[PDB]
Scaffold this active site. Structure first.
Site, PDB file in Angstrom:
ATOM      1  N   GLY C  66       0.823  -1.189   0.000  1.00 17.29           N
ATOM      2  CA  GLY C  66       0.000   0.000   0.000  1.00 17.29           C
ATOM      3  C   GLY C  66       0.862   1.246   0.000  1.00 17.29           C
ATOM      4  O   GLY C  66       2.008   1.225  -0.441  1.00 17.29           O
ATOM      5  N   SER C  95       5.609  -5.824   0.105  1.00 11.75           N
ATOM      6  CA  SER C  95       5.870  -4.391  -0.062  1.00 11.75           C
ATOM      7  C   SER C  95       5.892  -3.744   1.318  1.00 11.75           C
ATOM      8  O   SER C  95       6.686  -4.183   2.169  1.00 11.75           O
ATOM      9  CB  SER C  95       4.845  -3.821  -1.042  1.00 11.75           C
ATOM     10  OG  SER C  95       5.163  -2.483  -1.383  1.00 11.75           O
ATOM     11  N   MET C  96       5.071  -2.726   1.588  1.00 14.74           N
ATOM     12  CA  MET C  96       5.038  -2.130   2.918  1.00 14.74           C
ATOM     13  C   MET C  96       4.576  -3.120   3.977  1.00 14.74           C
ATOM     14  O   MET C  96       4.895  -2.941   5.157  1.00 14.74           O
ATOM     15  CB  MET C  96       4.136  -0.895   2.923  1.00 14.74           C
ATOM     16  CG  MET C  96       4.696   0.283   2.141  1.00 14.74           C
ATOM     17  SD  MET C  96       6.322   0.805   2.726  1.00 14.74           S
ATOM     18  CE  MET C  96       5.941   1.348   4.390  1.00 14.74           C
ATOM     19  N   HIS C 120      10.453  -5.382  -2.270  1.00 13.91           N
ATOM     20  CA  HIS C 120      10.763  -4.774  -3.557  1.00 13.91           C
ATOM     21  C   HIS C 120      10.874  -3.269  -3.381  1.00 13.91           C
ATOM     22  O   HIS C 120      10.350  -2.696  -2.421  1.00 13.91           O
ATOM     23  CB  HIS C 120       9.702  -5.109  -4.611  1.00 13.91           C
ATOM     24  CG  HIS C 120       8.397  -4.410  -4.397  1.00 13.91           C
ATOM     25  ND1 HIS C 120       8.002  -3.326  -5.151  1.00 13.91           N
ATOM     26  CD2 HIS C 120       7.398  -4.634  -3.512  1.00 13.91           C
ATOM     27  CE1 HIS C 120       6.816  -2.916  -4.742  1.00 13.91           C
ATOM     28  NE2 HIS C 120       6.427  -3.693  -3.749  1.00 13.91           N
ATOM     29  N   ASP C 171      10.721  -7.816  -7.719  1.00 12.97           N
ATOM     30  CA  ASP C 171       9.930  -8.510  -6.709  1.00 12.97           C
ATOM     31  C   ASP C 171      10.649  -9.755  -6.212  1.00 12.97           C
ATOM     32  O   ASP C 171      10.882 -10.699  -6.971  1.00 12.97           O
ATOM     33  CB  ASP C 171       8.559  -8.879  -7.277  1.00 12.97           C
ATOM     34  CG  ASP C 171       7.715  -7.662  -7.593  1.00 12.97           C
ATOM     35  OD1 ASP C 171       8.223  -6.530  -7.447  1.00 12.97           O
ATOM     36  OD2 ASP C 171       6.542  -7.837  -7.983  1.00 12.97           O
TER      37      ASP C 171
END
Ligand SMILES: Nc1ncnc2c1ncn2[C@@H]1O[C@H](COP(=O)(O)OP(=O)(O)OP(=O)(O)O)[C@@H](O)[C@H]1O
Ligand SMILES: Nc1ncnc2c1ncn2[C@@H]1O[C@H](COP(=O)(O)OP(=O)(O)O)[C@@H](O)[C@H]1O
Ligand SMILES: [Mg+2]
Lengths: 99, 341, 191, 321, 94
Positions: C66, C95-96, C120, C171
């Protein structure tokens, strides 16, 4: 209130003797009864009756005083308010003098 | 002659730590009670009436203790009732005349002595107004006539308040009533009245003092908003307030009173001929632990008992143990006292 | 969705099942990290510190990622508040989500055995339109965020910044075991 | 004289098995109570107050047996009360001092003995308020009046020792709410030691009025009886069930005997009912009803052996003649 | 119940003489057999048990007062209104 209807009005009450528990017959026809009490929520009933306190364009609005004038409102008390307060009409009719 | 209010307070200090203003109120009221009782009752003599008390204070501040300590030197009948046990007349539970029944039983059922006695009604806040409220407002209404002058009809220490019942006439005109209770939500009401303020860009915002400070300025308006009917507050003209106990009050309670907890266990240790000593830090720690648990002076006994349990289990066998010492570690840590021989 | 209601014995109190779990100091981050979902996590973290500043807070993460700024509000709240924030990866932390997973208290970062953890470099933190001067500014800000994320990730994982720069280039999907070896999590729960 | 806290536990171990912490706690509190009652209660001395005990433990752990054993030891009268036998509405006063009538009847209505007696209150946790208020007003010093033994009698309960007890079922979770990290978490404490660290805030959260906690300073805990203690209970105590039924068979010419596996199996069956040693009597009587009816008919019998198969299966006790 | 308990446990009763001098009768060795149709006992037991359940893998279910009476416990009789000290003096339940 129901039990006081016949006591205030003329009846023949059967009470125990002077000592321990023949019962005594007493006629309450000529016994004067003076009831008294601080009807707390009575001024609000009198105000709701005399002061409409409606809402809208076509309603006269008046709640500009926060505390009800107990003296002025009690001075115009009627059996309608005492009935809406909690008293039965059979008892109010037996208390004709409202001081 | 009569004991002055100063002498009455002097005997309340041996048992109650702090609460000087309520001790003044109780002493003056008892002194006026005596004077009224020995005032001539006929002729051009003016008819005197009583000034009852409403004793407000937090839980565990010393209300019930003030009454018990006052009863030791009253020279008149005294009882301690509880309003939570009362109910409306025609409902199951105790009636307000049972209070006079207890007061009459304390004096060999001599009506002349009960009519001049004193009554303490505890938990007066639990009958607050906030259909038929048999346990609350109904009890307040039933107490109105009893607190002021009336001729009560009490049972002879044997049964309930029934129609088919033998009765005794007791005049409660000269009977002093001392009502007490821990009005918990009263501080909020006093704060609402004293810090109204208002909202808006054009409104005046009022500044925003704990239970003690707010109770010290209590008015009938707050007691009415709390749930007490004005007919009852008017019969309780004197309002005495108790200050909540702090840590220094707790350590003084531990050591200062005549039958203080430390003196309790010291005398208990004098039976087996040993000396019990508490360090100042030990008492300060007991007070902190009783305060942190939010118990008050109620929990001091549990702390001292749990700290001296293993030593009391070994008292009558440890011969030559001239002294016992309770340190700060014994209170704060799970340690054992020092046993000096 | 209909959130079930459960009864806590104490009298009784009726909770929705998530408020009942918050009573046990369990905070959920489920789905994308947005301003609104991140602020709920922050509100819960602040509330739980007030209830007990010493007891651990359990941060359950099932999130594909996000907003970076939204995730940073959670991240700074986790580091600020006194109680340790333990993190657990359920399903995925990408991610986050993987950043906040690695952001848990060292020694208390967990993952379930079949969870998937992906790290990533950030994508667009916002569009790059307007004039070349505006695009240069947004490109510079994205590069600063990229370096900040890699630097904080390297700190969490006890790795060199150069390692995170290689591994977050594209990724990077990891099993729970690979994330434990990498330094994103400390333990893998089984029973 | 008066028994020391060590001698109290010594005599109390013969009737109760286990719960040594509660045993010594009761011994100390009772010894101190009856030493306070020997103080010079007059003059400028210190007015001594009593210390009551709160027994927290499972059902069948022996709380009532502990209190009754203490009473038998110290020659004092004892009556067990039940907070479940006190109703919210009504005259909670009139029936809370009926316990005093019961205690007086147990000692020929002599107030000198009843005022220094012991009272056990069952199910103290099942009232988690009017009952609590009355028990509080009675635990504290108060003068109560009851009918005569045939004029009313007065009783001041200040010197009466009160031992309240009950199985606080949901107290352990009230404690775990503050002693552990979490309850519903993945790695967060999923489920008498914690009863031992019980604090007043836990009992108050459980629903006990704070003023009642203030007059119960001594908190003692009883551990659940395991499958081993339930075997000793069957054999060791002065009034062991094995001893009772062996006497029943012994007034006749038949020697009753049990197999060790029978005692272990019957103890496990009692433990499976969540009642402790209370269920031991029913299962023992069920097991021995096989012979208590036939033994009158059997002739030439000398001993009976009760095997584990009688307790577990529909087996008859072995009759050897 | 209390006046009956005072007899069921070992006590001495005073009763009129054989003719119109009261006789002291010790009831330590008098056996008491009490009985009655406890009409609320099946509901008391059915509240103690009869938990039931819901779902596919759960057992779901006129009161079988036979097996209910066969599993009576002293606390059930206490709930019916009998004093606990009397039930404790009535160990045999037929
Ligand atoms: N001011 C005090 N001085 C000495 N002891 C105190 C004081 N206040 C409380 N205590 C101790 O607390 C115990 C009970 O206090 P008390 O019953 O007087 O509080 P209370 O005001 O009646 O509480 P509540 O309002 O809840 O009834 C007493 O045994 C006493 O030892
Ligand atoms: N620790 C124990 N030692 C010996 N007997 C026990 C013990 N606990 C329970 N019992 C037996 O269980 C029966 C009832 O126990 P009870 O006193 O009701 O326990 P509680 O008061 O804890 O419920 C008694 O007859 C007693 O013999
Ligand atoms: Mg009090």
């Amino acid at each position: 209130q129901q039990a006081l209807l016949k006591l205030i009005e003329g009846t023949v009450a059967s009470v125990p003797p002077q000592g321990g528990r023949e019962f005594i017959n007493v006629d309450t026809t000529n016994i004067l009864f003076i009831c008294g009490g601080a009807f707390a929520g009575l001024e609000k009933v009198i105000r709701q009756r005399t002061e409409k306190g409606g809402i809208g364009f076509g309603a006269s609005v008046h709640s500009k005083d926060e505390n009800a004038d107990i003296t002025k409102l009690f001075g115009i008390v009627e059996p309608e308010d005492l009935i809406k307060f909690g008293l039965i009409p059979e008892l109010i009719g037996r208390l004709p003098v409202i001081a | 002659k009569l004991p002055t209010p100063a002498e009455i307070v002097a005997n309340l200090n041996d048992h109650v730590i702090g609460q000087e203003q309520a001790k003044k109120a109780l002493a003056v009221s008892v002194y006026n009670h005596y004077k009224r009782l020995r005032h001539p009752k006929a002729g051009a003599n003016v008819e005197l009436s009583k000034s009852n008390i409403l004793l407000i204070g937090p839980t565990g501040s010393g209300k019930t203790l003030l009454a018990q300590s006052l009863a030791r030197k009253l020279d008149v009948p005294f009882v301690m009732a509880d309003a939570t046990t009362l109910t409306e007349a025609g409902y199951v539970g105790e009636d307000v005349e049972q209070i006079i029944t207890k007061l009459l039983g304390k004096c060999d059922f001599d009506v002349e002595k009960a009519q001049r006695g004193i009554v303490y009604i505890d938990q007066i806040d639990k009958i607050s107004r906030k259909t038929r409220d048999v346990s609350g407002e109904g009890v307040q209404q039933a107490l109105l006539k009893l607190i002021e002058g009336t001729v009560a009809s009490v049972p002879p220490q044997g049964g309930r308040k029934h129609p088919n019942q033998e009765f005794i006439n007791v005049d409660t005109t000269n009977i002093l009533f001392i009502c007490g209770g821990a009005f918990a939500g009263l501080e909020k009401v006093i704060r609402q009245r004293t810090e109204k303020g208002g909202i808006g860009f054009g409104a005046s915002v009022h500044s925003k003092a704990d239970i003690t400070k707010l109770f010290g300025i209590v008015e009938p308006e707050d007691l009415i908003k709390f749930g007490l009917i004005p007919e009852l507050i008017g019969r309780l003209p004197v309002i005495a307030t108790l200050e909540i106990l702090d840590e220094d009050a707790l350590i003084n309670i531990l050591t200062e009173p005549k039958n203080a907890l430390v003196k309790q266990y010291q005398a208990l240790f004098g039976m087996e001929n040993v000396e019990l000593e508490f360090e100042e830090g030990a008492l300060r720690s007991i007070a902190r632990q009783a305060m942190e648990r939010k118990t008050g002076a109620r929990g001091l006994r549990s702390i001292v008992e749990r700290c001296l349990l293993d030593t009391m289990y070994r008292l009558p066998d440890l011969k030559g143990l001239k002294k016992v010492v309770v340190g700060k570690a014994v209170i704060e840590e799970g340690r054992e006292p020092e046993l000096v021989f | 969705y209909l959130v079930p209601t459960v009864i806590e014995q104490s009298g009784e109190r009726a909770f929705d099942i998530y408020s009942r779990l918050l009573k046990e100091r369990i905070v959920f981050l489920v789905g994308p990290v947005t301003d609104e979902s991140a602020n709920l996590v922050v509100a819960q973290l602040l509330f739980l510190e007030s209830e007990n500043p010493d007891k651990d807070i359990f941060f359950y993460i099932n999130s594909p990622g996000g907003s970076v700024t939204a995730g940073m509000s959670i991240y700074d709240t986790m580091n600020f508040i006194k109680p340790d924030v333990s993190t657990l990866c359920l399903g995925q932390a990408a991610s986050m989500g993987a950043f906040l997973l690695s952001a848990g208290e060292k020694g208390k970062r967990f993952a379930l055995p079949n969870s998937r953890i992906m790290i990533h470099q950030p994508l667009i933190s916002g569009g790059l339109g307007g004039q070349a001067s505006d695009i240069e500014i947004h490109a510079r800000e994205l590069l600063k965020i990229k370096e900040k994320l890699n630097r904080l990730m390297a700190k969490h994982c006890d790795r060199d910044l150069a390692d995170l720069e290689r591994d977050t280039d594209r990724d990077n999907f990891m099993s729970a075991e690979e994330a434990k070896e990498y330094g994103l999590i400390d333990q893998i729960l089984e029973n």
